[PDB]
Swiss-Prot record, chain A:
InterPro entries: Ribosomal_eL32, Ribosomal_eL32_CS, Ribosomal_eL32_sf. It is found in: Cytoplasm. It holds the Pfam family Ribosomal_L32e. This is Large ribosomal subunit protein eL32. Coiled coil: none annotated. Component of the large ribosomal subunit (LSU). Mature yeast ribosomes consist of a small (40S) and a large (60S) subunit. The 40S small subunit contains 1 molecule of ribosomal RNA (18S rRNA) and 33 different proteins (encoded by 57 genes). The large 60S subunit contains 3 rRNA molecules (25S, 5.8S and 5S rRNA) and 46 different proteins (encoded by 81 genes).
Curated annotation (Swiss-Prot), chain B:
Keywords: Cell cycle, Nucleus, Repeat. One of its GO terms (cellular component) is nucleolus. GO terms for biological process: maturation of 5.8S rRNA; maturation of 5.8S rRNA from tricistronic rRNA transcript (SSU-rRNA, 5.8S rRNA, LSU-rRNA); maturation of LSU-rRNA; maturation of LSU-rRNA from tricistronic rRNA transcript (SSU-rRNA, 5.8S rRNA, LSU-rRNA); ribosomal large subunit biogenesis. This is Protein MAK16. It comes from the Eukaryota. The keyword Cell division does not apply. Belongs to the MAK16 family. A motif (Nuclear localization signal) lies at residues 138-143. It comes from Saccharomyces cerevisiae (strain ATCC 204508 / S288c) (Baker's yeast). Its role might be as part of the apparatus concerned with the nuclear events of the cell cycle.
Swiss-Prot record, chain C:
Part of a complex that includes BRX1, RPF1, RPF2 and SSF1 or SSF2. Pfam families: Brix. Residues 227-244 are annotated as: RNA-binding. The lineage of its organism: Eukaryota, Fungi, Dikarya, Ascomycota, Saccharomycotina. Present with 784 molecules/cell in log phase SD medium. The keyword ATP-binding does not apply. This is Ribosome production factor 1. InterPro entries: Brix, IMP4/RPF1. It comes from Saccharomyces cerevisiae (strain ATCC 204508 / S288c) (Baker's yeast). GO terms for cellular component: nucleolus; preribosome, large subunit precursor. It is found in: Nucleus, Nucleolus.
From Swiss-Prot, chain E:
The keyword Cytoplasm applies. This is Large ribosomal subunit protein uL22A. It comes from Saccharomyces cerevisiae (strain ATCC 204508 / S288c) (Baker's yeast). Component of the ribosome, a large ribonucleoprotein complex responsible for the synthesis of proteins in the cell. The small ribosomal subunit (SSU) binds messenger RNAs (mRNAs) and translates the encoded message by selecting cognate aminoacyl-transfer RNA (tRNA) molecules. The large subunit (LSU) contains the ribosomal catalytic site termed the peptidyl transferase center (PTC), which catalyzes the formation of peptide bonds, thereby polymerizing the amino acids delivered by tRNAs into a polypeptide chain. There are 2 genes for uL22 in yeast. Component of the large ribosomal subunit (LSU). Mature yeast ribosomes consist of a small (40S) and a large (60S) subunit. The 40S small subunit contains 1 molecule of ribosomal RNA (18S rRNA) and 33 different proteins (encoded by 57 genes). The large 60S subunit contains 3 rRNA molecules (25S, 5.8S and 5S rRNA) and 46 different proteins (encoded by 81 genes). uL22 is associated with the polypeptide exit tunnel. GO terms for molecular function: structural constituent of ribosome. There is a cross-link at residue 37 (Glycyl lysine isopeptide (Lys-Gly) (interchain with G-Cter in ubiquitin)). The modification Phosphothreonine is found at residue 61. It comes from the Eukaryota.
Amino acid sequence: LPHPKIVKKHTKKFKRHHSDRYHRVAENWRKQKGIDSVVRRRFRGNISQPKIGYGSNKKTKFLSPSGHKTFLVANVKDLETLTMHTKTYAAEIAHNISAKNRVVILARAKALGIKVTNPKGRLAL
Amino acid sequence: SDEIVWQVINQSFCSHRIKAPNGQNFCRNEYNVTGLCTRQSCPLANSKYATVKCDNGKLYLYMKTPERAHTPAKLWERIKLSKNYTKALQQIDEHLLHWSKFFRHKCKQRFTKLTQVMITERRLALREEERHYVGVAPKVKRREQNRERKALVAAKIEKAIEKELMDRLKSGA
Amino acid sequence: NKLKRQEIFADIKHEKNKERHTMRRKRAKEERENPELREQRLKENVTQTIENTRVYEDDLMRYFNSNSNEPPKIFLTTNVNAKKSAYEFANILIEILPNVTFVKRKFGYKLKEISDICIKRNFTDIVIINEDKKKVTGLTFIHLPEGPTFYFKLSSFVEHGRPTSHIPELILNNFQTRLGQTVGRLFQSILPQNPDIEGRQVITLHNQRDYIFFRRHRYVFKDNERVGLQELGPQFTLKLKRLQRGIKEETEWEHKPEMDKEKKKFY
Amino acid sequence: AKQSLDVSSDRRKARKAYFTAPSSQRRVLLSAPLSKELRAQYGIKALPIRRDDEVLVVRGSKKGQEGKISSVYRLKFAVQVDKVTKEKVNGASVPINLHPSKLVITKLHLDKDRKALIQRKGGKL
Amino acid sequence: NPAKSASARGSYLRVSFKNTRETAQAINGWELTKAQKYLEQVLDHQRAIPFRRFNSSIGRTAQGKEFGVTKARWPAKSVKFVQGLLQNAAANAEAKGLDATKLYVSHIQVNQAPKESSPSHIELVVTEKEEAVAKAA
Amino acid sequence: MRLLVSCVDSGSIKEVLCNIGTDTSVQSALQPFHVAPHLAEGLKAYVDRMWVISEDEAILARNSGVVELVKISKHLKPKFDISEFEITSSVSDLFDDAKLESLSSKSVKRTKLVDGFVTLCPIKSNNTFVAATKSGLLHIIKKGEDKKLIKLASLGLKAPVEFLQLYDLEDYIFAYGGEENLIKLVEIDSSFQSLKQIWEAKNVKNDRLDMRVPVWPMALRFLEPSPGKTEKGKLNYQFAAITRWSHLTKYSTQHGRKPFAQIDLLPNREPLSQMEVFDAKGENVVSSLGNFQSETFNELNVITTDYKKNVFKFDGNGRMLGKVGRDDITGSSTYIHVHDGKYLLQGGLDRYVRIFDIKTNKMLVKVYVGSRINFIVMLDDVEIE
RNA sequence: AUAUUGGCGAGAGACCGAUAGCGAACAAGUACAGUGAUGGAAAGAUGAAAAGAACUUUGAAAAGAGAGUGAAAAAGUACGUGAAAUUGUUGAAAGGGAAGGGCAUUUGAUCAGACAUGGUGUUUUGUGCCCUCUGCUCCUUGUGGGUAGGGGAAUCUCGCAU
RNA sequence: CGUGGAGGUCAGUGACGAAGCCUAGACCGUAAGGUCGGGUCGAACGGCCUCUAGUGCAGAUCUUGGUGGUAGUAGCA
């Protein structure tokens, strides 16, 4: 699909303050609640915080580098909902699907022209 | 009626929706034109509804009349659509006379894609592929790991060559 | 009752080692005086390994396999759209096999259409290497007329030898089974029948299980009944599959996981 | 579906009742079906199992193998069929614990009370 | 190569851990015949073990000059466990059928055990030293 | 029992002499009394097809081009009686490799493309046999009064042939076919000079994909003609066939030229071969040429073999009736035969003779031969003391 | 008719799931502590079956090494999954009286990176659901559906194969 | 946005490997987090529309359990 040049604004992950120093403090983002915190008062040098400005362009949101929107698929029935949106959406074969069923899904998605984001998953030659 | 059917499935459950991470909604009711679901693009909310499907290679165009709201057994009236593309789009047009321009070009569009799904035959005539997907079951992944590591230990390759060089070049002296 | 169980069996294990070896120290002392008493123990008491407990023509030689009459030309190809590691692997087969031509395989020419070319160009064998991902996985030797064809699986490749241009001597191990000696037959055929003695290069094909290991070495003879050897060439493990009998149409063995259940047999 | 108020559909009560069952109740719980030949003769589906009767093993690794029951190990809910034996590493023989639902009786051991048991259940010896 | 190797292991051994670490790394990468002779010399106060990490209040001696360390000690008990394992690994190698003269410890490793006590696991892996080579024009 | 096991790697006949319950794979089990190699003529001249005539006479056909009449004679060697084999007559040069090498310009896959015999059977107590090759040749080899084989007439058919089956249900006619060759019925004259194609099959309507359905029939068996009012012009010949594309196809000529029911037996169009006929209770339901003796397709039960390792059983409606010796057969199956209606003869590329019971699906005999089998016939099943 | 945290015996739960739930899912009011009244824990899971590692060998013992059973010991009576702190070994990198962080980049190491292969317009033929001859069958309004027997390409791209 | 359980639904996923655990692996979401590949595993589990609560941790000289530096130091009369 002819897509716009996808701008990301912030590629780096918004890690927590002192997530790296201490081990018990997780890298998952939590706001600094204390009034005397430098991160909360956004001092120069300190880590950047997640705010609404970093939000992605509506036209190019949810899009993978291929220019397709991601879409989970369990079986051949859920796969065949994207018979009309091959250029827009891409089949993401779910993690828990067996190797026995994937060979079936990949056969159909290849025929319908649906780009699968994760082929070669559990499947040798 | 049908507005009351829509609002009750728009929220309050259309029990065949797929919420994609894109926030998009997909009706998997086999009879819808757009795989996506929206008002009068899904076959339950709307009362007049056309669709192209395939049961075999024969591509039929199903049609739903509000006359048959009483009887769900014979809801979808269906017509075969020749096989040549040009006469089929013309075949489509006559059925869609005096309808929404939605079903007019969208059944035209269903027919287009489902005919270029018959690129399956192209893949299956020029198949002859020496690959075929093989599963890697994690039991086999260790029957063929931990037994090779047990092979090498009992193998003693060095001692085997050391024997069958001396045993060779004594007899080939 | 884990807390009871833990102490009881730890003490029993402790008790058993004392008793096991006090018996053995008395065994040692009676063996010092009489050597003969030890001899009878070794007869009755057996180590009972897996090998000990295994659960149990001339026209062919030429017609299905290549002999010492011609130089055998081996048509080395690769599975379509392969990457660096496959050609890196082809460079290891470019040395070891006698007269290899590498053919870049460009989509189509299904399989029989290939056979038409290698009849005209007059090749003897076809070998094809395949890749699922970045690692090499499968190796397929086919004989061009008639078509005895062998499939193989590689689970080991690790890389200080650096060999000469001299041609290596063959050696095979443990092919009692008739299906084993038909694979032994393939590697007798497909590898060179030249051995130039000097240059001192040996290629092995050891098969103590259903797994076959091939290695290269350098042998140095000292007159005191011993020979030394250094590691050289590619490390390797193969698994036999299929024996497709026709070019690809028929089967003779085709590995299933219905074996491994026996823990023995070994084909 | 449960209709009676006397019987319980509780898992906890049912598993306890089974594992803390006495030897007499375990005799009935260790019942084996009869082969199609004996079912045709005697006109009965299943019986409790004893010693001096023959049996054929239907399900398991020892599939199709037959023999004669040595001892009903009621404590371990098991039978031990003679000539269905796993050979230990020291050369000794240890019997496999089979379950009587997996077995099938081929040749019964008719005693007086056994004859009466058949006649009670609608049999014709 | 597992074919050119033998390995002894002692577990839940009632030794001082910190002493065992020093006497393990003192003997690491050495030929087996030189190694066993060295520990006999440590027992008779001819040579001393170089202590590097766990080395507070160790008396400074001249014998540490071999290893470029000021501090060194003669730990009898820890060495006694190690030469017991090395004697075992020597017999393990001769069980497989390795050469005794070309034998050297490649990987010797010591880590703590369940506990108060301070017990320790020791494992050591001996290896052949393979040279044996020639060429031709 | 006594068997004639056709070997190819040696190019001979190995003779199996054993009992029921014989197993060569287990050392503590019963052994066969005598294995016997006979007429070793190399790999270039292996025996394609045979026919047992009587107690002391059996015809052969070799892949060098030679059809041979061989005399059987018994003598002593506990208390067992081994056989001697002597070539009395030989009619040679019956292949035409030029036709097959010219036609198959990649038909499917064969590099050597060897011409072999597809049948060896009697025309009718006649001393008169027929032999057909893959190159469309048919030779009417008659055994003379002086016990010497003479060729009456060589006949021509549309290549390539794979099977040829005669019709011995009076109530001369035969049928034949191969790769992209339909089933065509040909009537022979009593003089054996004239052949006339009375009927030709039509391929079924296209699949989902509108592709042409592949045609490669591998074996045919006849049934007794359809009952009721026989239509004029339309012939009365009920028969079934197996393809290389899993199609169990059933033809009633009274119904039409197209087969009334094509049934995919296995998925993914797995290659199949050798249509045998058996009965579920272990009974003889067929003639000497294996043709089913009934007027309905629903009574028919068939055994067929793939090229992976399997031997299948199917009814008249393509329902799967269980595999034959799933455990023991590790290689392919070159030849199967329903002997007496209560025994199965089997032996393929794994190089073992197997005798299966029809009723209980139980393996009776396992004999190592050391050579690839392509043909087995049972002489008798009388026990040896 | 009513009460009921005891007893005897049941039936249940939008309850808890081993630091929870009773103190106690187990040699629990036990071990143990207190002169005594009393106080009072910790601690569940090998496997399908012990098939619990025979036998050779290293040591007075403690533990190892070969070898084997099992689907898996990458399940060993320290026994399902086996997290983090922390410890050793190996490999890589850095270190002149501080490190870790943010913006940006180089170098070193390293991982991704199509069983993607056509699309269109003409031309040989060969087939079919195509033309044509003869039909049969489900039902609702014309703008229906399914399904046989023959023939025929010298018209026809209508489709699919070359 | 997430967690335990309930009703409903996806004729959902699942010994051809569910849940969990890691991972110098990849993608999405400003973020809460979600999804996927690889490795380990062995039996159940998830999305969706709703319900319900003993529901989200860095601290409390927090409670419990485990493990360090101190340290082979003071020390053993």
